[PDB]
């Protein structure tokens, strides 16, 4: 159960990094589209 | 996670085809 806990934590960490990257990218697209206006 | 990755990939695969 300890090993399964650390494995779940690792997959959650990879997903969290990918989510923060795509989130910031979408925010930058929205900033550019609003600045062009 | 895998689905999201390939989703991002194909959308990126769409974008130079617009460029």
């Amino acid at each position: 159960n300890h090993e399964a806990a650390t494995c779940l934590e690792d997959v959650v960490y990879r997903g969290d990094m990918l989510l923060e990257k795509i989130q910031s990218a979408l925010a930058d697209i929205a900033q550019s589209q609003l600045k062009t206006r | 996670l895998e689905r999201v990755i390939e989703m991002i990939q194909n959308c990126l695969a769409s974008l130079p085809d617009d460029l």
Binding site: L18, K21, I22, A25, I29, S32, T36 | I5, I8, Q9, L12, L15, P16, D18, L19
Partner: protein, 44 residues
């Protein structure tokens, strides 16, 4: 002469120049953003 006043231009040529420059900058920045996301992969 009235029929040749019909065409489609009304602004002063300075305003035509402003519009042309602004639209050139718009196409430049949009192509640059799309090229940025062409090159950038958030994933590996």
């Amino acid at each position: 002469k009235l029929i040749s006043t019909m065409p489609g231009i009304h602004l002063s040529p300075e305003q035509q120049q402003q519009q042309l420059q602004s639209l050139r900058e718009q196409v430049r920045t949009k192509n640059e953003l799309l090229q940025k996301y062409k090159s950038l992969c958030m994933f590996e």
